[PDB]
Design a protein around this ligand. Structure first.
Ligand SMILES: Nc1ncnc2c1ncn2[C@@H]1O[C@H](COP(=O)(O)OP(=O)(O)OP(=O)(O)O)[C@@H](O)[C@H]1O
Ligand SMILES: Nc1ncnc2c1ncn2[C@@H]1O[C@H](COP(=O)(O)OP(=O)(O)OP(=O)(O)O)[C@@H](O)[C@H]1O
Ligand SMILES: OC[C@H]1O[C@H](O[C@H]2O[C@H](CO)[C@@H](O)[C@H](O)[C@H]2O)[C@H](O)[C@@H](O)[C@@H]1O
Lengths: 361, 284, 436, 265, 361
């Protein structure tokens, strides 16, 4: 089934909002990401999806029913919940047998279900200890399979790879995707980390302060941030914003002036004449002017600002000045003077008096 | 390392030394008095008894029925005080009201002087005067009859015994972070089944140690039954029986034997709650 | 120096009143500290036995209920009165005494405890609820059945509880029926030795069983004492009772503040300010008279009721004797106290205005005394056939063993239960088996 | 949900009155006039102080109260100070047989005191002593300590020693500033234990009968257990009730203010 | 002061060495990263570094003083615990004034230094909420608060940034570096985040099984991993590896052959001739053959493989099939056919029977 958060909102006494009517839908068998800062409401939303937090206002609908108040058994959905809980005073195996025991299956069927289940998610080689013997990452992967086995109407999953190294994390990410594919089941992972999000979601929702900031595909959000917040949130290192001003040809910058593409000029002229602009640019587009061909010299502004420091990270020289992220192919050194190059095609415009992406489709 | 073992023993040394002195030598003396044939009216002529002190008690129906009535009272009081105390702990935990009110409500019946409780119930059940007796149909005579009187004293002692073990079980759930219960009712929604089939596993020594103790506390009874009856309706407690042989008749030969076999009669149930059910200490 | 004296709780107020009255005389020689023991007889006996055998040097003097002297003397606890540093306390004893209390003071060989008060059971009835009391157990049942059939205060208030007051009531029946518990030398049971003894006992057992099984009886009669008896009559639930004199000042004093619903007293102008501070009734002569004459038409009294209607009942005695604490570090002053407290200036007070009969014979010859204590005649004539107790060091065990087998009072087999009694007391004479 | 809130509200109000009704019956009985006490009605009409005045007048209660509070306080401190010296060994440390050391400690408070009553009378507790504060204190301590140890053990498991590792980083000295934070850490456990054990100890009746002697060395439980009205001629009940209310309330109003740290414990 | 571990091991009866006799001098004021997998004795090494633990074999000297078993307060250091224990039963200002109060400064000077610390550490504004009222990352930053007020000779710390967003975390790391610079402090951090490791370490110590796999710069370890294991450990995604066979001129691959550069054949001739080799390829060394310049067309091996998976990362495609991190200028998609190109200079080789780096300097 599809799920639908129609204006769903939460307020609690210190009354104050934890969610200011954030709104969404998840299509049948879709994979979503939610992402946002700590305390931005996601823990609310999953408690609200469970029908266990009080939905203070709005309308959760699923499968043709309004369901804001329905208990988890009535909902027929599960959480791969952040606390990575599976039972002490019990076996590892019995923690994964608990849902199966609620499902009260035939014992041979149960042993087969466990056998596939524990060939999956296999954080111990079916070690089947008392779980307090195992490592926290192993427990996390165990709690993962432990929730995973039931194939409910939907799944929610809570930044689980944070408990793990990145190598095994991406392996578990791929496994997790293959699982959701094989399940074809309505799904959301949740994180604070956009690097996880951009690979995992068919469509990401982003929050700040109990409100949705945008919804779309990962490359929609990357191509077309809805506001200066999500433009600052996306990418790594994050988008450079520099103080800039309008010109009839395009823009004026801290170190020069640039022509704007005709369609962006047309939209900028359908828009107001703002006093201040954040030019949004991904720092990785910036290069040493020594590296350019003639086509790039046509397409790019080049200008000089001191490399006040130069870190280098194998991919880039992280040129501090602010940051300017040239390829490490440029042999520029810490504290040097340099001429930077940037493709004039790539600059996003934000009106710095409002934070709206003036360049956005 | 010898040093840190030695300092641990030095910290134990006063407590264990006096803890031996205040019990072991008294007990050794008590069994020697059970070897003795003695009366306090004529203490000097104390020959040995040829196990006869024990032989009298194990021969005696009054002892056996006094034993049996305490077994009856203890098991049922254990059962009900547990059954109540479990719910009491859960409501004292999960009430939406100001929890200091329920915390106040439960501590006072735990704290009140047991004798005063004994009197209050005794008067409540005195016919005509006692409102609880007075409301019945006439000729019921609640104090006159064994099973009614027994039932009443159980129904009296609960208002002192269970609030303590409900507090014990409250700490017995303070050791459980409530988010674990939340994690249990995630998936496992339906808290009648959920809260039981989690607390059943989850309470390892939280409840166990709260069963054997209350049980021996109950077996230690020497009060409410006594003031309620003097052992009449044949409602004699083994404690009252011990007192009866000693302060009414001064047969220390019998009374010491009774004392020590009562000490064996705790030792067996304590040993059961070591050898059986696991029943290990909470630090195990 | 000061001297610790232990009273019964049920009658301590009187003792502290005279303790003040003698301490003011005694002044700089010594003073007496009144102290106390429980209301229940065996309880005050065992609490004291604990106090004694704990070897306390500070308790100084006691009042034992006499029936507790044989064992003490057998135990060498307290002394034969000849051991007194003064000696002539044994010659304040004798003197004016009645002989029955002195018979209580004397053990095998010596006298051991100076007699100081005595009782024997009086019969009581509401003279406003009936004329002419039945004087008989049979007539008692029949008239109680009258009141029950009339829907009146049908209860009969005999002391039913498993403590020795019940055994005493029983013993008064047994000796009134002409039976006795043991050989006179307390060496072998006699209550069923002969069919005449069986008959005498089993008659009393039928009486006991027919009592309380009578319809309209007190349901909780099975646990009662003298106070609950008195109170139940004052509460108009009973109409008959068999007890002792204190009852009178208890009625009088209660009525003067409340008491009987059927007689105001406290509303009477003559009775205003009659009772002193410390609650005591303390009447003027006329306040006594008016309370007395008002009570006389309400509550009547009589000699104890007969098993045989033609035969005066062998009513059982009780009382107290004083004794020196054998642990006391000083004791000539304890005999000096014993003398001045046995003295008539105390004795007369303790009967007239303490309510408890003093054993000094000349007191009844005062018309002032006699007038304030009219039951004295009934007492005096009850003395001369009074039923004694078996008088042995084993008496507490014997009596309690009896009380234990007696416990199913309304429910005994009168025949078989006599064998149970004989076997129980046999083991009690043997000094064997547990205190139940 | 308002339905479930009514279901809460009713169980909340019923359970408190269930707890309280015995004390209402007691208190009301002590206020009711002599005439009215026999009435089956709970209604406290026409109230009188006379019983309470008859308790306050004369030292009968107040002496044995002063006995009781002293023996309680002193029995508390000596139990917990010995307790707190030992609790570290079992619940911060390890030593051979420590599991059996707690294995006995959990038992040896909870004896049937009747077994232990007779030997102490026949020893120097009733012989070498009897009418003495030590004579009654020693058995109280015998039952206090294994509770103090048992309870303190729980109140030591609840604290990880990892903070003391950081402490030896900020300064490695034994006791000193380390005591000056480990004692602040431990203190809430100490007072929770001191409360419960005081109340328990104050709650005895058996030895409080069977070895106590006179208004010097008799405790208030024993006093009310044998007290029988300031007038022989009134029914004792109204006085007995007034005294009972008077003696059970003061500890109650003390501990209920102090509930916080024991409800934490 | 300089610090000098040599043969330093911790052993426990199990007998098992938790640290297998590690060795390193660390210069006065140097910054170090310790790194390895979890279970690599890191928690052991923390106690051993502090002289809290016992040197079961080997020796530790600092400033030329022997310190093997010398408890932490002997060494004039400070430290932070991975799960960030900090002084309970006092609020924030009290808790961090406390070690400064052991350092027995005048109370006003302590409060002034702590007030500076509240701006400097800046884990929050100065709330003075009770310790449990704050969240875990804030406590961590407050334990860093404790470390800054100590101004010690040396430091040790474990994964604080894991509790935080990586930008605020890397800012905190840079603030920490400015501290270590200003305070010239002999410093180690332990870090599984290879990015934050590489940007902080003057020198990394790499461990596996309690033994030193290498010591060097991040650029050394990136350029020249000592063996096939550590070549898999370094960077993200890890180096690709292929079983490939020596030719008389270089290597024959699963997808072609490359003539090894003469300068490197010389080393391959100072070495034995292994029959089979784990040839290592940098994922970022791999590109779409259509994107190339003339020198790359000339010099690269180019060869065709199905782009079975194409992960999209904005700047790159992670073409998984093995993982080629091609630039996002290639329009190639999941399951498409493509010719991949590789720079010979970005290869490495390890003998397949032993994992020893044949291409090592
Ligand atoms: N009992 C409560 N009273 C008041 N406010 C509450 C209560 N419970 C939750 N909240 C609100 O919810 C928020 C906490 O949940 P939230 O999920 O936003 O934080 P979080 O758990 O850090 O989220 P995440 O970890 O997913 O970033 C707080 O900002 C608070 O205002
Ligand atoms: N008492 C002990 N007995 C046996 N081994 C011990 C003991 N104490 C410590 N160790 C050893 O020390 C190690 C402690 O964990 P380790 O040093 O691997 O850090 P870790 O916590 O596993 O790493 P991470 O910080 O990544 O979780 C164990 O591998 C164990 O072998
Ligand atoms: O005479 C006043 C005393 O009456 C009670 O004692 C008598 O009555 C008891 C039966 O209940 C007898 O056992 C006892 O022998 C009698 O002396 C009362 O117990 C005493 O306290 C009174 O002083």
């Amino acid at each position: 089934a599809e799920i639908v958060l129609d204006r769903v909102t939460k307020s609690y006494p210190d009354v104050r909002a934890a969610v200011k009517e954030f709104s969404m839908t998840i299509a049948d068998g879709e994979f979503i990401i939610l992402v946002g800062p700590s305390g931005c409401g996601k823990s609310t939303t999953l408690n609200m999806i469970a029908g266990l937090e009080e939905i203070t206002s709005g309308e959760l609908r699923i499968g043709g029913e309004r369901v804001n108040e329905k208990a988890p058994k009535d909902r027929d959905i599960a959480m791969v919940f952040q606390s990575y809980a599976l039972y002490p005073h019990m076996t590892v195996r019995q923690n994964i047998a608990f849902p199966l025991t609620l499902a009260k299956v035939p014992k041979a069927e149960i042993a087969a279900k466990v056998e596939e289940t524990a060939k999956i998610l296999d954080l111990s080689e079916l070690l089947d200890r008392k779980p307090g013997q195992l490592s926290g990452g192993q427990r996390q992967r165990v709690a993962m399979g432990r929730a995973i086995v039931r194939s409910p109407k939907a799944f929610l999953m809570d930044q689980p790879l944070s408990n793990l190294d990145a190598k095994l994390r991406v392996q578990m990410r791929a496994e997790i995707s293959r699982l959701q594919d094989r399940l074809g089941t309505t799904t959301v992972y949740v994180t604070h980390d956009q690097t996880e999000a951009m690979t995992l979601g068919d469509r990401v929702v982003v929050m700040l302060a109990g409100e949705v900031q945008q919804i779309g595909t990962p490359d929609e959000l990357y191509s077309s941030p809805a506001n200066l917040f999500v433009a600052g949130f996306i990418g790594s290192p994050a988008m450079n914003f520099f103080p800039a001003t309008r010109t009839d040809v395009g823009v004026r910058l801290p170190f020069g002036e640039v022509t704007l593409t005709p369609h962006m000029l047309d939209l900028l002229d359908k828009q107001a004449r703002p006093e201040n602009i954040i030019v949004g640019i991904r720092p990785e587009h910036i290069e040493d002017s020594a590296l350019l061909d003639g086509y790039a010299r046509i397409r790019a502004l080049t200008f000089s600002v001191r490399a006040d420091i130069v870190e280098s990270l194998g991919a880039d020289k992280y040129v501090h000045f602010f940051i300017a992220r040239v390829s490490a192919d440029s042999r520029v050194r810490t504290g040097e003077q340099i001429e930077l190059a940037i493709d004039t095609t790539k600059l996003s415009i934000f009106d710095a008096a409002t934070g709206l992406n003036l360049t956005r489709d | 390392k010898k040093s840190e073992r030695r300092l641990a023993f030095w910290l134990i040394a006063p407590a264990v030394l006096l803890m031996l002195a205040v019990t072991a030598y008294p007990i050794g003396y008590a069994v020697w008095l059970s070897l003795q044939r003695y009366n306090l009216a004529e203490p000097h002529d104390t020959e040995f008894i040829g196990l006869a002190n024990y032989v009298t008690v194990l021969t005696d129906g009054y002892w056996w029925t006094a034993f049996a009535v305490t077994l009856g009272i203890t098991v049922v009081s254990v059962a009900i005080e547990f059954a109540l105390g479990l719910a009491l702990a859960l409501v004292m935990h999960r009430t939406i009201f100001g929890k200091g009110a329920v915390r106040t409500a439960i501590l006072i019946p735990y704290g009140i002087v047991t004798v005063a409780a004994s009197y209050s119930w005794y008067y409540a059940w005195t016919p005509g005067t006692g409102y609880l007796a007075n409301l019945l149909p006439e000729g019921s005579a609640p104090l006159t009859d064994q099973l009614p009187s027994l039932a009443i004293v159980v129904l009296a002692e609960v208002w002192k015994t269970t609030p303590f073990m409900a507090l014990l079980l409250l700490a017995g759930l303070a050791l459980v972070p409530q988010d674990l219960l939340n994690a249990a009712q995630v998936d496992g929604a339906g808290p009648w089944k959920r809260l039981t089939k989690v607390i059943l596993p989850m309470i390892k020594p939280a409840i166990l140690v709260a069963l054997l103790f209350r049980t021996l506390d109950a077996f230690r009874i020497f009060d409410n039954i006594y003031i309620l009856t003097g052992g009449s309706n044949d409602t004699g407690s083994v404690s009252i029986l011990g007192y009866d042989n000693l302060f009414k008749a001064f047969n220390v030969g019998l009374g010491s034997a009774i004392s020590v076999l009562i000490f064996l009669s705790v030792a067996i149930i304590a040993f059961i709650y070591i050898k059986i059910f696991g029943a290990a200490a909470p630090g195990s | 120096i000061v001297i610790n004296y232990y009273t019964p709780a049920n009658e301590e107020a009187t003792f502290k009143a005279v303790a003040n009255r003698c301490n003011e005389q005694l002044g700089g020689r010594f003073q007496i500290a009144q102290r106390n023991l429980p209301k229940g007889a065996d309880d005050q006996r065992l609490q004291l036995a604990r106090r004694l055998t704990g070897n306390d040097k500070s308790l100084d003097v006691m009042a034992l209920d006499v029936v507790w002297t044989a064992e003490f003397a057998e135990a060498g606890w307290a002394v034969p009165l000849s051991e007194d540093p003064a000696g002539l306390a044994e010659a304040d004893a004798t003197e004016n005494t009645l002989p029955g209390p002195l018979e209580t003071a004397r053990w095998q060989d010596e006298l051991y405890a100076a007699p100081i008060t005595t009782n024997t059971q009086l019969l009581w009835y509401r003279a406003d609820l009936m004329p002419a009391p039945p004087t008989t157990w049979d007539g008692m049942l029949d008239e109680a059945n009258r009141l029950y059939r009339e829907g009146g205060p049908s209860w009969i208030a005999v002391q039913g509880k498993q403590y020795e007051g019940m055994v005493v009531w029983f013993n008064t029946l047994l000796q009134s029926a002409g039976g006795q518990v043991l050989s006179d030398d307390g060496q072998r049971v006699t209550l069923t030795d002969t069919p005449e003894h069986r008959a005498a006992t089993v008659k009393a057992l039928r009486i006991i069983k027919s009592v309380a099984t009578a319809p309209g009886a007190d349901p909780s009669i099975t646990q009662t004492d003298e106070n609950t008896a008195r109170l139940a009559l004052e509460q108009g639930k009973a109409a008959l009772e068999v007890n002792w004199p204190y009852v009178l000042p208890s009625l009088l004093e209660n009525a003067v503040k409340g008491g009987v619903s059927f007689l105001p007293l406290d509303g009477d102008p003559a009775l205003q300010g009659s009772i002193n501070d410390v609650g005591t009734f303390s009447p003027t002569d006329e306040q006594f008279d008016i309370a007395f004459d008002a009570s006389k038409k309400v509550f009547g009294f009589a000699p104890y009721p007969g098993v045989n209607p033609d035969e005066p009942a062998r009513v059982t005695l009780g009382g107290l004797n004083l004794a020196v604490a054998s642990t006391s570090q000083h004791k000539a002053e304890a005999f000096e106290a014993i003398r001045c407290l046995r003295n008539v200036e105390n004795q007369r007070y303790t009967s007239i205005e303490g309510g408890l009969p003093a054993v000094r014979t000349s007191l009844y010859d005062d018309p002032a005394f006699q007038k304030k204590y009219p039951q004295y005649e009934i007492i005096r004539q009850q003395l001369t056939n009074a039923a004694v107790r078996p008088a042995t060091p084993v008496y507490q065990a014997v009596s309690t063993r009896m009380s234990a087998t007696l416990a199913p009072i309304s429910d005994i087999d009168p025949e078989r239960t006599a064998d149970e009694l004989t076997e129980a007391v046999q083991k009690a004479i043997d000094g064997k088996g547990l205190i139940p | 949900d308002a339905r479930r809130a009514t279901w809460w509200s009713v169980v909340n109000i019923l359970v408190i009155v269930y707890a309280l009704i015995p004390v209402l019956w007691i208190l009301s009985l002590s206020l009711k006039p002599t005439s009215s006490v026999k009435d089956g009605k709970l209604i406290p009409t026409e109230i009188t102080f006379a019983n309470y005045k008859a308790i306050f007048s004369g030292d009968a209660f107040t002496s044995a109260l002063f006995n009781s509070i002293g023996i309680g306080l002193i029995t508390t401190i000596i139990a917990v100070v010995i307790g707190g010296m030992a609790a570290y060994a079992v619940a911060r440390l390890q030593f051979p047989g420590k599991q059996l050391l707690i294995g006995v400690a959990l038992l040896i408070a909870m004896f049937p005191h009747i077994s232990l009553v007779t030997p102490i009378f026949n020893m120097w507790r009733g012989i070498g002593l009897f009418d003495t504060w030590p004579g009654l204190i020693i058995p109280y301590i015998t039952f206090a300590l294994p509770l103090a140890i048992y309870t303190l053990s729980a109140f030591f498991r609840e604290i990880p020693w990892d903070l003391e590792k950081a402490a030896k980083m900020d300064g490695a000295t034994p006791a000193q500033a380390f005591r000056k934070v480990i004692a602040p850490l431990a203190a809430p456990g100490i007072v929770t234990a001191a409360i419960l054990v005081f109340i328990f100890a104050w709650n005895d009746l058996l030895l409080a009968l069977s070895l106590t002697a006179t208004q010097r060395a008799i405790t208030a439980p024993v006093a009310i257990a044998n007290f029988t009205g300031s007038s022989q001629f009134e029914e004792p009940t109204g006085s007995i009730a007034a005294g009972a209310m008077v003696i059970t309330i003061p500890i109650i109003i003390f501990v209920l203010i102090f509930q916080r740290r024991i409800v934490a414990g």
